[PDB]
Design an enzyme around this catalytic site. Structure first.
Site, mmCIF file in Angstrom:
data_model
loop_
_atom_site.group_PDB
_atom_site.id
_atom_site.type_symbol
_atom_site.label_atom_id
_atom_site.label_comp_id
_atom_site.label_asym_id
_atom_site.label_seq_id
_atom_site.Cartn_x
_atom_site.Cartn_y
_atom_site.Cartn_z
ATOM 1 N N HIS A 136 8.141 1.240 1.215
ATOM 2 C CA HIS A 136 9.370 0.473 1.387
ATOM 3 C C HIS A 136 9.229 -0.999 1.020
ATOM 4 O O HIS A 136 10.241 -1.707 0.999
ATOM 5 C CB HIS A 136 9.877 0.584 2.830
ATOM 6 C CG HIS A 136 8.847 0.257 3.867
ATOM 7 N ND1 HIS A 136 7.954 1.190 4.348
ATOM 8 C CD2 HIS A 136 8.586 -0.893 4.532
ATOM 9 C CE1 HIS A 136 7.177 0.625 5.256
ATOM 10 N NE2 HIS A 136 7.543 -0.638 5.389
ATOM 11 N N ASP B 17 4.130 7.239 3.619
ATOM 12 C CA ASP B 17 4.809 6.019 3.180
ATOM 13 C C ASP B 17 3.811 4.957 2.715
ATOM 14 O O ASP B 17 3.930 3.781 3.061
ATOM 15 C CB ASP B 17 5.708 5.460 4.285
ATOM 16 C CG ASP B 17 6.915 6.337 4.555
ATOM 17 O OD1 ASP B 17 7.398 6.994 3.610
ATOM 18 O OD2 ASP B 17 7.385 6.363 5.712
ATOM 19 N N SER C 66 4.751 -5.577 7.560
ATOM 20 C CA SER C 66 4.196 -4.260 7.288
ATOM 21 C C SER C 66 3.084 -4.361 6.253
ATOM 22 O O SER C 66 3.133 -5.179 5.331
ATOM 23 C CB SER C 66 5.285 -3.309 6.794
ATOM 24 O OG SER C 66 5.814 -3.745 5.555
#
Lengths: 49, 151
Positions: free
Chosen positions: B28, B50, B102
């Site tokens: 992402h 992810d 992140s």
């Protein structure tokens, strides 16, 4: 002609053998892919748990 | 430096890190890594976790962080300070970290990476983190508290 011909009248034993192998082989190969996909999903689940 | 910011339009969208000899970044996180040596690497899409990964260039092999699966309950360090891990959950005080954080690694008392942060959940006075960790057998797994927002 004294007889009546049908759709499968001409299909020989060898022709049915090849049809069964082609239908069975492709079907079995598809199932193998689906089973492997489901089994790996369980393997990943056990990795988390 | 072993952590490299990811920027799309000049703003920091996330961070990348080199762990065990691989470059890690979340799916992402959009943008390019400031280090051209890493940005030029073709990354594999591990949609299971992810994470995007690739092989560290030989010129960058020395900038690699050691990792471990031995993560006992206690306090761990990261770029925003201490991190508390208990009951198989990673938690930080509320307000410590947010969008853009992140991909940061979490290090133990020996400087070994134990997790990569993907996001988190604000639980009252504390925020729970979504992290990628290795189980007791060292197998990569993704821990996601319900409702976790990607950072």
């Amino acid at each position: 002609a004294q007889h009546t011909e049908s759709f499968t009248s001409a299909i020989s034993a060898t022709a049915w053998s090849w049809i069964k192998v082609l239908v069975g082989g492709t079907s079995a190969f598809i199932v193998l892919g689906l089973i492997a996909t489901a089994v790996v999903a369980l393997v990943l689940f056990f990795h988390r748990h | 430096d072993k952590t490299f910011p990811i920027m799309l339009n000049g703003q920091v969208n996330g961070y990348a890190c080199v762990v065990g000899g691989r470059v890690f970044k979340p799916l992402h996180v959009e943008g390019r890594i400031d280090n051209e040596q890493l940005a030029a690497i073709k990354l594999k899409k591990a949609s299971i976790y992810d994470l995007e990964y690739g092989d560290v260039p030989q010129c960058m092999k020395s900038d690699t962080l050691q990792y471990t699966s031995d993560k006992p309950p206690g306090f761990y360090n990261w770029h925003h300070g201490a991190v508390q891990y208990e009951n198989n959950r990673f938690t930080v005080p509320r307000g410590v970290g947010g969008k853009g954080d992140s991909g940061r690694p979490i290090l133990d008392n020996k400087g070994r990476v134990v997790a990569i942060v993907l996001g988190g959940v604000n639980e009252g006075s504390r925020t729970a983190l979504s992290v990628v960790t290795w189980n007791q057998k060292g197998v990569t797994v993704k821990d996601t508290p319900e409702g976790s927002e990607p950072w």
